[model samples]
Target: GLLPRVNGTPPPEVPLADIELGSLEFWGRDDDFRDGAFATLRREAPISFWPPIELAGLTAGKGHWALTKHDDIHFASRHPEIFHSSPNIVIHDQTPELAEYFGSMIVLDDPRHQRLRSIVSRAFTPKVVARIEASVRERAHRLVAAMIENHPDGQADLVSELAGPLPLQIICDMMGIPEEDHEQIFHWTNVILGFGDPDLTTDFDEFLQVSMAIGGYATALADDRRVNHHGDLTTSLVEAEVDGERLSSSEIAMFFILLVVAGNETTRNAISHGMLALSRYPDERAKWWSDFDGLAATAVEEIVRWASPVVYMRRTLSQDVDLRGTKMAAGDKVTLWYCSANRDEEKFADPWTFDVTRNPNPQVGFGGGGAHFCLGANLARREIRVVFDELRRQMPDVVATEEPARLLSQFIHGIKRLPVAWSR
Candidate 1:
């Protein structure tokens, strides 16, 4: 049962190129096809070639190289110059304008990237971290209380009710965004990230509109912060400077858009998966609940490592290089599969098992190791712990009533909806 047996059938025997790895159909229902494919790649084609997703209109070049090994991914992540994050980070190609607009700091290399990171780094200092931790703690309980109030009959969709709102609220609150616009912000992020979902639009024009909306909203917020200071990250980002230099309005807007899109999606899915994992592994759930505080720290890490929120990020090869006997050239798109690496047998003792108390867990659920490692890692960890802590206190017997409605995109490991109920 290494592969997810769909409808009791074994995974299909498909050629690597033929299998559209990033397609909605390919990753439908569960992770079987993906797992089976990656498992084979890890063993046979550790650095095999991956065809561009033709369906997405990305048939311009020869395919990229897929790096599924933990060591390889770690190496690539550490060597960002060799595996540059320029042009674009997504496997699919973007127009020059789109690339420049969306890529922002995440797709830049040192000097430029380091510059942006330093300016943004002010928001992550100890004082800000403490503020965020306190906010997460206070909001986690309030979220759980609201969920209970709404679902008084003991049943609810955890995705919409709890998992989804917690991070959205936290990110928006941190940015000094008004409460009324939270749903609008959430909608824009969903349309941008959930492009593969039919419920969300797959049309290119509509996608551009959503992207514009996010950018526009962020731009307005930045403009306001320029004149009227606030106790928020938006103000910090707009006001932050180095030697009389500062981020332009466009840079501020795009960075805010990145934070909202990346920050919200990862944390939301992590919380969703945390609940599902605990419900599936009752013994580990009990172990965690026995002394929640004692285990909260490690349990949060395990949850993130087990449920890698981001599936993969693309890096273009800056120079020709050989990886595990495979020759790669400059400008080739190389994908570092976090999902595959997290389950890499070489890294974890029992890679497939979900153990909450996994000590010294060197999982790169966050970017393996690089300048581009997730900026919001600490905040995400805190949010996961706080949400689960509240759940343990409020509904110790909460259980998922049905399988999740999963996101169709291969880039993000997300649950769109998860039904759940607690003992009455």
Candidate 2:
């Protein structure tokens, strides 16, 4: 045999539109379907068109142009002026009010976008990042200890005990949120990110309520910081001014909501998938584990490349343009598929192989480039590095003994649950 045959059955060619990248059913299918489908797209239809995504009770979008090439995505990300982020970063459409409430600054253009980034970046200076790194180092061991204590007899679910809590705790702690509210915060984030998945949220009303809850909680925190002054990230945001102008309560609240939701879901899943990848490639794990610190830089990058936690983000064309001779008009929805790009043959030497020592890995696990690159990229990298260090120390023999319960959404590459065990 040439290699592992996980798909068992190959997906045959079909009518182009039937590939249905927007379909929840397609998203819910096994990894084989996704890999196979994208492989074909990269080979044949690098900028293929697909029908608009449809979800009941949510506004639908115009048809979409799928950009699967790493080059195409990098170009789009670098040229945000041409590939507008406004209206919706998601495939579906939303009014500015609705989009801003949930997505915050990411759904805006300059000077609104640049203004917000400058102010927020002020809060993330060297001092704050140093403090954050200390917390990550201290908390990773504590999290592993707690996981060991909770999962006696060596059986554990990584998502429940370790992966999920680490990022949630870090983000909340940084925001000066107390431990008591983590459960509620986690619930709200899950519902919001879990909108497309029926098991987590069945309808638009439920999703809206959770979104409001996140905003409301963030708003209350901002109000408190205004008077009490906790000196936390929330306080920093409340006070940070660009050219003598402070962020409004609404801006702070929305950004706060964006932080918790985006930081939590994406980091946790990245950690979850990292563990899964390490277990599957024992040779790679051992190579990194033997000298963890030496490999930390590239190992973490490899994990992000493998996981690509956020599947895709949609950008509207600001002006008519030609990409690979495919004419596109203004206001067209162009989706940049990060998952496809991470596995792009044109980029990585061996796209399918999981190698922990892959340096110079131009993984766009964060946005490809330009203004909208992930603000939390360094924070995420630290978390992955610290936690895996603890995993190597405490559970050197740990392995994902069973399959993960994956999220059913086109936008996020989520791992709802992952079962694992270490030898006694």
Candidate 3:
């Protein structure tokens, strides 16, 4: 009803006030409704402002500016000095206690961000990637094997069976968390990232306890790794030194939280949505199935572009500036809309179409190019590619049978459940 099934931008009558972002009602709607709202914003108010989103424990700021265009995100990322990533990455300013427990490279600026990235980044080196790739491939096949044995009825939840387990297993394996602990790790990560969802979390009290649980677990694990060397990423993290400075125990815990939440959850959602996209577009699925290797490179990019897993990341304006005729003062919050940017009419051809052969696809799903760009981009890409390839090989006819149950969250594009079936 918002738009009359019109292509391209919505009609001009659809004013800015009509399309709101970050509201309780807004996040409850499906992708189609949400997509329409963002499309309208792109055409009408590319640099729009809305009242601040109030969180339970966070400081309420004046409001925040939104940059919904691809080019504008590119510009903001390129000039990090002007658009600082301080006071946290969400519209609501986090308190000092929570910041101390939650802060890491993602919410930091210059030297510290650079330093954390450097120290923890050794996990993804070329040599380690080869090992990781081997493990990824094995893990995908192992998961598919399990599906065949347990769910022979061809009726299964792909999110629970295939999409959810692979990324979590790989991350935990690399971090040296044992299998017994994986279940709680998975549960903890979701609660921490569940912003608007009442199912995973109802209040900040529950949210705080869950986060502290994960941090405590990470701290204890790091302590063990210090005395007993396992050569896992956790061991490396606790022992890593940069310019003769080693990371603190708390710093390691924060980065561990980052890894499980950002690294595990984001990729898991990307894979989930990728399967949903394939089912929705039969032709694209057929094309990829025919010759996966020939089209996989583009298919992966298109999936990330389509999914835009993490919806928006906030950046604070350091100095007074104007963008696209919108005036903004110092310390103003500017949120880069990755979901909107990936569908930008200016940057993509037929942005609405989920084409598998989308070439030269420049997606900010990983993030705009900057110090804050997703460090796990390559690892995530590898996981997506491998998982789909394995699925095509084992369960070639796997198709989502029902519309997925989506997570109600403004921050993440997550799927709670996806019913699917396959035929031999």
Candidate 4:
């Protein structure tokens, strides 16, 4: 059993050998309170103050203060001028190659972030998303049909069947990859997306090998669009110009990566996590079936809040600032724990409980108000609604019978294998 401890700050220059180390895989488990499977690192190594808890040598990735409260995360997000997102968002921060690709929109401060956001905003308008809704539904139905067709006695893994393929196909369709190449594109995405699971990936080098190959292929696809522009996201991105500057080759790679990471991963997890939540709470599922459009939307927030995909996004301080009395200096790192924030008792009433009829749901599940708010929010929500609607409407007897195998990813938290059984 994992034990929870509350301790004072460790010595600033504590040696790795001296500090106790443990695995961070516990984060992927569903025990947010860290009941038996995992323990609350928050109580022992809390981030309420600056220089948050040290995992010692738990991660090969970099370390930053993990912001675990909803109010604190909201405050950090709101003050972009001070608490900026551009420095080192990732655990180890970004590699030079990765940096060239994203250019820090998710991490940047003010003018640059705003300008890039404006350029991309034209493509993701609410109307555009509304139009894309039909496609999402169509894809969901086709995916579910194929899964059921191949289902062994009405039992199958939702992650493989519904969760994984649905989002990848949606992203591929948007990127205008040929229907034939969708599988290859998904294979390419695994390089980056498969990181959370040590089992799925051999090493960083192996993953990078996949990414380079994908980059070459993605470049070819971009070149094709350059000559004959298609009316899709690939073409949109290839043609996109900020202040009369076209996105570089590296930027294009980064854009597709972001799209897949943002669009595909999160939506897939949302569906799996939402399904798990619904299955765990029968009354919630019943209420959702009663009115998926009205009440279920709130349920979606609760589910995403509970699921907390796109876990924690990091930001670097530009200058000294005090957050809840913790003084942070320039170049300091802070992680906004969206998952922890969603459960904050101050912001959410009885947040730990799963409520189907939750109203006035102001979840920062998507993110706080900012230039980097999720571009794919509409599509993600619609996709969740489509899949869940079908699960209840078509396969009315579905239940999550076995353990939900979680993806071992730090950035994208979700189920890798959701073992389920259902009756037609």
By TM-score, the best candidate is 2
* Tens-digit lDDT string for candidate 3 (198-249): 6734577877889889999999998998899875777778777778778877
RMSD of 3: 3.2
Shift of residue 27 alpha carbon in model 3, Å = 1.9
**Reference-based TM-score of each model:** 0.91, 0.93, 0.92, 0.85
Per lDDT, the best of the predicted structures is 2
List lDDT for all candidates, in order: 0.81, 0.83, 0.82, 0.68
**Candidate 4: segments with Cα more than 4 A from true spot:** 1-32, 35-46, 49-62, 94-97, 102-104, 125-131, 241-243
Candidates sorted on TM-score, descending: 2, 3, 1, 4
lDDT of 1 by residue, 254-280 (tens): 887777677887899999888887777
RMSD (CA, Å), each prediction: 3.4, 2.9, 3.2, 6.0
- Residues 1-424 of candidate 2: C-alpha lDDT, one tens digit per residue: 0123331234444444557776767877877678778878988888988876577776666779999999999999999889999877988754456888767889998888998889988877565666677778888899898888887888888988888888878888788888789889888876766666677335778778888888888888988999998647888888788898788878888887787778888999999999988877788899999889999999999999989999999999989989899999998899999998998988988787888988679999898889899988988999999999998888889888777888877888989889888864
Deviation from native of the Cα of residue 325 in model 4, angstroms: 1.7
Point out where model 1 deviates above 4 Å: 1-24, 56-62, 94-96, 125-127
How many residue pairs collide in each prediction? 1, 0, 0, 6
Clashing pairs in 1: 4-32
Candidate with more favorable, higher TM-score: 2 or 3: 2
